[PDB]
Design a protein around this ligand. Sequence first.
Ligand SMILES: CN(CCc1ccccn1)C(=O)c1ccccc1
Ligand SMILES: [Zn+2]
Ligand SMILES: [Zn+2]
Ligand SMILES: [Zn+2]
Length: 459
Amino acid sequence: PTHLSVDTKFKTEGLCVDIPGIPKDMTYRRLISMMGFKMNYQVNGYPNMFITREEAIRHVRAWIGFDVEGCHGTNLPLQLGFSTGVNLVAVPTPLMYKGLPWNVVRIKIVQMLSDTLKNLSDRVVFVLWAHGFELTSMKYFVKIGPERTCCLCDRRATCFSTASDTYACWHHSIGFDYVYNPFMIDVQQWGFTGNLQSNHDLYCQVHGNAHVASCDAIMTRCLAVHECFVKRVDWTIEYPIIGDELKINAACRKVQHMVVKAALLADKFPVLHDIGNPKAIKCVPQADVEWKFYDAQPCSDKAYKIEELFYSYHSDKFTDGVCLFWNCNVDRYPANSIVCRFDTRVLSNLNLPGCDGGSLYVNKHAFHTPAFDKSAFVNLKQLPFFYYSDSPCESHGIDYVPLKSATCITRCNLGGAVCRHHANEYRLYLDAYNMMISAGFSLWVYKQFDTYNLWNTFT
Ligand SMILES: CN(CCc1ccccn1)C(=O)c1ccccc1
Ligand SMILES: [Zn+2]
Ligand SMILES: [Zn+2]
Ligand SMILES: [Zn+2]
């Protein structure tokens, strides 16, 4: 069981207002045929236009909510809405475009999908709350056939051109007019009671209904993300490398070690309470502090309430020493904390829009993160940049310009002049730091944290 069988039944109740008289007994095979597509008994990598929930979860980066509303159906204009916020009007002759024929609407669809998806995925997955018009509109902008490769590269083809009779991926499709071998999934097949808005609004207050096709397209994809990543979590699913994943994860490990060591030394805490991942390792192994771990998986729905993490009777005294919350999202951090909190608002190829202000951060695994909330950090302050090192000043083994910086906390800078080794290490650490910040991570620390206390650790 790899793909969705075309002989699987498809519930047609949601389709009968736009398509009256539709048979209750229906397969994907018959539905695809009714949509104007012929699969010709083809065993060439595209067995079904529709896919399973498990296949959709593996391809979450390709998700594009799609809805079609009858503006007035052969004789009436259609409003095509996409979870990108785009609304196109197709005439049969929050962005709102005026009525145009399909031959130009399809050019716009290919440009919009290519620009949104070229740095996310090798395909498109149309996420539907199917009522009929969206399925019957597909023949006007979609072509299907055997799996193909791009004419300019080795990537799979996602677009087709009638002008040149050629195929292209999302990177090489400028001037292409047809979406080729798209995938799709009808959320209404998952077993829901009531309409789209009533199921969406149960879990999300961020997406409203301005009564346009893009609002429904947005709500549909949000509801699909809630079902697949919020109420259901699967951290075994691996996702391909599409950007700076490796550099970001390595930077996160460097910054954590740097900041936690410096806190321990500067304030000499006797105990550290490490709250978060149950598979966490001591980030400063050569530490003399009493290191105590507390297990909490990444919260994907709402941030943990500090009252439930800490209270109901462990050291018991979380007020003793320091608390380390490294990607452990809580509602209000205690004053004696060191915190790394992912900012869901960040724009990047790793961060996809999520449910109720949250975001879906996809880096090796998929992690739905509750909305970033500035009030969580009232007891703390922003952690400023600094580099600390007690390692020997020794080059060993890239050209040089001398480093001058008030934030290079080293014996050499204390002594008046930064050595080559510590300048190279400072510059590498500043690059790792900037990578992690730009990726969306934000750092917070207890108000008494002062790097001035690190200079006396050189005596
Ligand atoms: C300084 N602290 C805090 C606990 C402490 C406080 C006072 C004396 C000893 N240990 C460390 O755990 C530590 C970190 C990095 C290197 C070496 C020791
Ligand atoms: Zn290509
Ligand atoms: Zn929503
Ligand atoms: Zn040095």
